[PDB]
Design a protein around this ligand. Structure first.
Ligand SMILES: [Cl-]
Lengths: 328, 326
């Protein structure tokens, strides 16, 4: 009932049915407590991911206003850009991608394999830049150039993280609540926290549907101090758009992303190897590997509010495995 | 139900809900033909694919025999080996893979990226062989060796293609029949180790007898492939207490110069589906099968001009192994 103003926003159907919520018996056995996983990595469009939930709302908005071109930005190995380009192809929309190399790698698989390979298959127009120092401004400059060609552009921010995009994860929280109902008494939820839309959406949804559940964001690019205001801003904007209040404190752990965004670390790699070998589940070196390392250490250090079941949100990212191999 | 004997087989749930069956409006508009797609590339385990449907029955059997190890075989970039290894990891079973390099490549991505990379993640024990000249025999030798080493192995044949494995594609046919009540003249599928083709053959005979099932070969001529598909067709039907009289249809014009080697038509089919529908095919299987489908249109090769259903059997992780070239 409380999230009913969600039905107001037009949305396209890219996912279909609720994604699986699975128990992880072998990981749970190893970690010494109940771990469940929300399989948002399993969606039907071009290798899946959390970004698709946001695109359901963003692209419906684009269509509503008569846009014929989607413009967005990210790393060369961005999952969002790949999912945006896939959706654009599907719908016969043009797509323009402003890409940066965030880690200064010259490794050929990072440069041309994985997500970047898929972009070419989707006929994405590629605009390279030195760095995304001011993505919102840089995207508008690009959109102006594109508009001059007679295209009707729709700008999608980095990671699809606007209040509207984040509605996708308010929706995901509904699924989670219904899937857990009479099945599992959840204590904590863990999600990677990057451009912040996923975290913020879940934060609003879970505050209203499962208020006693502790939502933990594991940062992938920023410290708590830098990240927290971004998550809060979105949380409040989302709540406002839904005619709701959001009084919950945002929780973030920033210990698991060093030496920085898009750079693999040992604990991340070990988390990837653990999920693959114990559960046959594929994580990624940029996002989910790092988020899972956070979950594991949180259990190790008793960081969670209590000992109860933890739900891991699998936000996707596996195609990056092929870009990061063998190194850099 | 005429297919009642299917529930008599022990099966693990690896997939759950039926996979999507989708209309492809943009491809359809471009080809001037109604095209639908069975999304068996969207299965929840380790980047998905058709092999998982087979493994539901094969691995259930493995556990019934009390096995602790799964042993199978394929190319370095085998989708089947990758899905078997993921399933073994999930269930806490050892996995031993007998791998060959079918194309003589030394390309790094073929040798170490894509499906092969995932094998390492799943802690697969890898055994390289010069050639899978007699896979069934070579797998048995390995199994006896492993059993002598103090394990309880279960052998899964190449591509998971046994009568039991092929039950997974009788199951897919039931989904197709259910989902097509809103729609069909033809079905197109890649025909390799033959379990998918044969399973669909038996299912579709009983569920949608007016539909023409076309197998596009990915490794063999019609002469070499037809007896393999018929034999499995007959074995499946026998075990389900059914008769299978339907002819097997095969097109072999679309796989040159051989298994696991991309060709231009195949890669162009990949580009077409990606750019028109946001759908990812693969260089080894689905790209070639789709190339066949498209040529079937332009050569008026189907029995009539009506809607076509393409079976997406998966394979997309191989894109990353075949890039930039082999
Ligand atoms: Cl332990």
């Amino acid at each position: 009932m409380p999230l009913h103003h969600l039905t107001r926003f037009p949305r396209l159907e890219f996912i279909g049915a609720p994604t699986p919520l699975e128990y992880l018996p072998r990981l749970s056995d190893y970690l010494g407590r109940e771990i469940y996983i929300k399989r948002d990595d399993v969606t039907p469009i071009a290798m899946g991911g959390n970004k698709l939930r946001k695109l359901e709302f963003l692209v419906a908005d684009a269509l509503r206003e008569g846009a014929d071109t989607l413009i967005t930005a990210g790393a060369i190995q961005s999952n969002h850009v790949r999912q945006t380009a896939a959706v654009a192809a599907k719908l016969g929309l043009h797509c323009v991608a402003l890409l940066e190399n965030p880690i200064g790698t010259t490794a050929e698989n990072y440069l041309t394999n994985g997500n970047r390979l898929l972009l070419d298959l989707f006929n994405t127009q590629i605009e390279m830049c030195d760095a995304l120092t001011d993505p919102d401004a840089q995207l508008q400059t690009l959109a102006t150039r594109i508009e001059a060609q007679g295209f009707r552009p729709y700008v999608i921010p980095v990671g699809g993280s606007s209040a509207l995009g984040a509605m996708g994860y308010v929706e995901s929280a509904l699924e989670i609540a219904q899937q857990c109902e009479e099945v599992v008494g959840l204590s904590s939820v863990v999600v990677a926290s990057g451009s912040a839309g996923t975290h913020a959406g879940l934060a609003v949804g879970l505050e209203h549907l499962m208020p006693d559940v502790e939502l933990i964001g594991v940062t992938v690019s920023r410290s708590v101090a830098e990240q927290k205001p971004k998550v809060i801003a979105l949380q409040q904007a989302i709540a406002g758009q839904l005619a709701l209040t959001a009084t919950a404190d945002i929780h973030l752990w920033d210990d698991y992303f060093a030496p920085g965004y898009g750079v693999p670390n040992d604990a991340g790699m070990e988390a990837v190897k653990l999920l693959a070998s114990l559960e046959g589940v594929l994580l990624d070196p940029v996002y989910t590997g790092k988020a899972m390392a956070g979950l594991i250490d949180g259990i190790s250090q008793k960081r969670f509010n209590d000992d109860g079941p933890i739900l891991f949100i699998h936000t996707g990212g596996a195609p990056a495995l092929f870009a990061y191999h063998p190194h850099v």
